[PDB]
């Protein structure tokens, strides 16, 4: 082999995967990053090599947005992946392929907010009937499934309760069910847990989160275990219009390379800064992953490879009004906004940004959401201390 | 006492200058002419209190930039808001998700575009809604296929490829008196002719990938909405689905609708001419042009279109489908043999080889996709290349 | 006949002129088809051998860039020249022609109501390398032929000027540089290469500031170096790679971009102009207009003689009263103009040079080179005509 | 630490820590929308006000000054410890800036003879025909330049590491020279980053960066630097910018903003695989040496341990047993993960070799003279997994 040439049986190791994963310099012009096709049309030989070149219109498939979810494929692990404008909206195109009129569907009941949303108020006006239930026991899974049953949709780490749903045992009864197991590890990444290595059948990403990691666009990835599956969420992006546009995949082309890098010290800030909160005398609770008061630190153990995340959850003692005067009074470096998984820390409410349906996903009183940036965690440190001075 | 900035207070401008300017005013921190792209996830809050103050939170349900177009476009198509998605299909299937149930009936023109026919009778009929395909050139058609479950009547005009019109106004009038829904599609007509929330619709789906664009750069699509109800159930059922437009994208399209006008005006006159050409041409069995005195609907025709008659146009070749293939295969440069129609490079393409090639045959004359059926999106080159390389391509049939 | 097919473009063909804004020197992308050429955003190009370095033409993208590259070629076609070099912008275009062709000791005739930035580049600047700059009147070339040195190697023109629109001689000009045999650059940015092609009429270099009407849009800056020899072009090719301001991907692809409706956008832009100027030669507050559309204007036989198609979208004019009515007028006139300092572009700009720009400057200066008290530049957009008279009404009723 | 600032604010007298600053250094959020990035100013001109109020917004003409570029150049200035900044097209022209702004005919320049090709080539080729006089000497001894000094000389312009030799030059005492005879000293930090050394703390009037190499760090831009320790340089250089119209651009300066705030992980997961490669290059039986500053090999060892911070870097040398005709067969079967191509500091792993691809028309005797034997091999390590990169090297190694 020669220069531009894999070694023959190359298995590249992680962070090379990130790097250089499905994508090649340009075959035209040598470019090492993929160029950026901003371009609507693509013009044919003649009418009988009509898709000869493998691209008519940027809607159905765009060459930037091939290479993105070829290497996203590739680190997830699965058949094929599918791009799309938002992660939202990359549920959405699950929902409206996999789930007719009489369908049944299981839902994780401390899913995304705006995952719960869409199936409660959208999707059910099609009669189909959406059930949410609680994912950290398995055998509700396999007690909840109906004749009906199509799709089985759980998210390890939830947003924002952090609980873990243990996908392998999960799968392993969608399998013997011949279910079809959908994954949200948005909050997770594929460097700390594929599901698709663990028997899931669809895995849904907002890559708007940690594969930009830099608060700059939107998108969506469905990762399909096999060639029927990948056919269909194809066919329906392309129906329905919701394609990732080119600028975007390049932009995510980018980013993606260092998510290991950053996920690696976004965690060890998240350590640290766990253990900090879970010291403090103004704080009631911590969720996190890597503390030994992790309610799940057992299945965190069994499913989470290299990190415990970024992401961890507190409560303030004295409820409402204490939460909100320190959220009210957290200093720079923190963002206090709605994004999570970027260099820059985030500080969130779930509730203030009816108590009766919302103390039952798990978001009592005083719920604050962390996503841990790279900033130095010294000052990130410094100003949850000053911000717990006002609780 | 107006000063620099500030618009004349009893001075409504007038079309051109909606295109340059309407909806967008200088950038207030810096003066910038252009508004800057927001290409940015998220939106700091002063407080808890205080949420949504600045009104922005998160790019997936509003962004300044993709608001600045929407703005605009709202301004320009006559309607109280617009909605703006990644693609026209996304806009399209969004109204489809928004005003229709199990249970209800929904009229489409049978000559719809090809993207919008596949979506309702593949897709969204699996939920037990009944798409019905009605000839829309005869108004009363549509008021007799009305019933008590019908919610949306969508037309298009011109069509798709066939450039057949419907009469905006009288089917408008018809669905207001039925009190059912009236979406048309007016990609093909551009603001610029055929506004048809003037004439009585309720929603307007864009797809601005073609004129709005122009310039084979970017996708996208737009809902106009008439009410503030409309506007508001499609705003949130874009945050719902998650197919918005990007900023980048509406920046594009903030810089290309301001040629607009001309661009569909050196277009149209173009194809009045490649029109005349082909019709006096005798290797050419018909054309299809709302601006020459053959076409069927010349009255409705001169009744709806303003300042133009439209870059789109189509004509058979005498010889059908193989003389069309040779003559598409030898259609030279500056033409391009492509998808995409309203940019500012000509293009040829056959509905019945490329878009509908795996579709029989005998369903698609009913769309009145004759094979031999050519569709012509006609540019700004000059008109004598144009018609050098459409003889020269004639040649060959 | 022949038997060429879809792609080709016939044997022998020269395409026309609006075609050539919306194809020249671009084809679609050969390894997908893409109608438009994608952007290599991106900075070094892989080499599959050390035998095969540079094989496929790319490197590094300070040197050269696809996308700039297609660009380069699309303006060498529109202007009619050998070869084109895209800069960052304007200026680094002008910046690289006096780094290249000019050397201590050397003279260069400039005229004398230049644009401001080359201007202030020559004086400020290049004269500190010992470089004797020489402005003076170029409306008549024989000024031009009694100016020259032994020691000149440049003659830098501009038509029309900005702001006085003072024309050259493009022409007689060049016949004078052949004959003296010393090189003729001439900044064409006021007109475009629609209204006038400079080496169409002998000169050796073009200036083009690609933010103006290339753009046309107030979106990108840039610059563009137009080269009638081989041997010109490398020497600005090989001093763009050592000054390192060549034009990125993303601007290129703009202008790619932006550049396909100029002829539409310049006829609309003149049009408007013509009736603007026609509405302000009869105005009470206007004491002058400067138009070549206009019977007014003092060089019409050389505007006649020169200009293809338009007579342009820039104007210019003075209001009564002097700088204080000047200011007044500036401070009221209404949207859809824009108080600002670009030009060319689909909106209206409106300025006065003496108060805003050259505000530094005495005024003798000012005069010196025809600025006069109550002087307003005018970019005309593409708005409806009406609207902006009717916003230059109001704003000189306050003058 | 009583006090009463909110969301949104600083903590008073607050000096955030350095990754704290390469992630928020001189930007905030948008005061208009509060958008957490700086939007980018897509945008040649601005609109004013009034005649009285001109420019009182900050901005007239882009080729002048961008909203976007300003927030990069604050964020540089923040990070270099400098006064000012202002950002270029490339780096080149930052350096063709310094040049054309402290340099006027029958001036002396000093140089380091291993300074990058770009910048001797700009000094000989193109600056030397206005009667500008450049002496290349060695900067590895301070004492070196202080003799060198002539009554002409107003700029010395230092490189550390320098490329491709990674040859070190103490700027500190340089700097101390300087400022004695006093003369410019301007600083080339490309290949240190701020992140291992600042010259600007060590006592250097001007820095000069291109952005094209760390700071954007994936391949995808190019831009320039110069960094002013005084108001007086940066408004020459504001001032020569607006003349010479190679200003960097908006979208540019964007994908930098973005770009600078993983430098810190960036370099920091680059130079732990350059220590490790360049361990097992000083242990193969092809290779002759091995040139990295975090290897006791390294010629400059103790002004490496003084100079350096955090890291030793991501760029390593070395040379190949059996000359020219080796080197070229290394390169030709150097597979995978790894890139052949002339940029360096990104995330993709790139070698190439000077005396056969950029300096191939070049003296061999001119190349000796500047340090780039017949064998040497330039290494920028990526942050791939380092072994997929040795695997790499081993089996190039193996053909050569
Ligand atoms: C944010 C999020 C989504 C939605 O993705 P968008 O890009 O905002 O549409 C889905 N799932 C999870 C777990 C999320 O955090
Ligand atoms: C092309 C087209 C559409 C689809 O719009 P896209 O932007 O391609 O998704 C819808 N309607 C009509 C009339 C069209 O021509
Ligand atoms: C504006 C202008 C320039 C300078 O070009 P920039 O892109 O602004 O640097 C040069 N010449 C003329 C005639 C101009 O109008
Ligand atoms: C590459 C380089 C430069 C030139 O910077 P460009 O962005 O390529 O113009 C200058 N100095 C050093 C040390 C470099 O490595």
């Not at 609770?285 to 499913?303: D, M, N, T």
Request: net charge negative; proline share 5%; with cysteine.
């Amino acid at each position: 082999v020669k220069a531009g040439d894999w070694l023959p049986g190359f298995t590249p190791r992680e962070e090379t995967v990130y790097v250089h994963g499905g994508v090649e310099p340009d075959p035209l012009t040598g470019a090492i990053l993929p160029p950026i096709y901003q371009n609507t049309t693509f013009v044919q030989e003649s009418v009988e090599n009509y898709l000869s070149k493998g691209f008519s219109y940027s809607r159905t498939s765009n060459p930037t947005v091939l290479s993105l979810e070829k290497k996203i494929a590739e680190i997830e692990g699965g058949f094929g992946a599918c791009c799309f404008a938002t992660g939202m909206a990359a549920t959405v195109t699950i929902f409206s392929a996999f789930l007719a009129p009489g369908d049944h569907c299981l839902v994780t009941n401390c899913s995304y907010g705006g995952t719960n949303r869409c199936a409660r108020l959208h999707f059910s006006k099609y009669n189909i009937d959406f059930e949410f239930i609680d994912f950290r026991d398995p055998t509700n899974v396999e007690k909840a499934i109906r004749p009906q049953t199509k799709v089985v949709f759980s998210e390890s780490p939830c947003n924002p309760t952090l609980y873990l749903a243990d996908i392998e045992a999960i799968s392993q009864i969608c399998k013997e069910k011949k279910v079809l197991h959908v994954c949200d590890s948005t909050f997770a990444t594929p460097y700390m847990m594929r599901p698709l290595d663990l028997g899931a059948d669809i895995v849904v990403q907002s890559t708007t989160k940690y594969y930009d990691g830099h608060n700059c666009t939107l998108g969506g990835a469905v990762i399909s275990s096999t060639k029927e599956i990948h056919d269909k969420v194809f066919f329906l992006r392309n129906v329905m219009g919701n394609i990732m546009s080119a600028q975007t995949a390049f932009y995510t082309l980018l980013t993606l390379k260092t998510l290991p890098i950053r996920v690696e010290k976004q965690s060890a800030n998240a350590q640290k800064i766990a253990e900090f909160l879970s010291k403090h005398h103004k704080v009631e609770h911590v969720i996190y992953p890597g503390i030994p008061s992790f309610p799940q630190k057992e299945l965190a153990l069994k499913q989470h490879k290299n990190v415990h995340g970024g992401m961890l959850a507190f409560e303030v003692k004295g409820g409402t009004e204490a939460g909100i005067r320190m959220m009210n009074h957290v200093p720079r470096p923190w963002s206090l906004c709605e994004n999570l998984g970027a260099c820059e820390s985030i500080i969130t409410c779930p509730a203030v940004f009816l108590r009766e349906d919302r103390l039952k996903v798990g978001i009592t009183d005083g719920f604050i959401r962390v996503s841990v940036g790279i900033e130095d965690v010294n000052d990130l440190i410094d100003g949850l201390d000053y911000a717990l001075s006002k609780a």
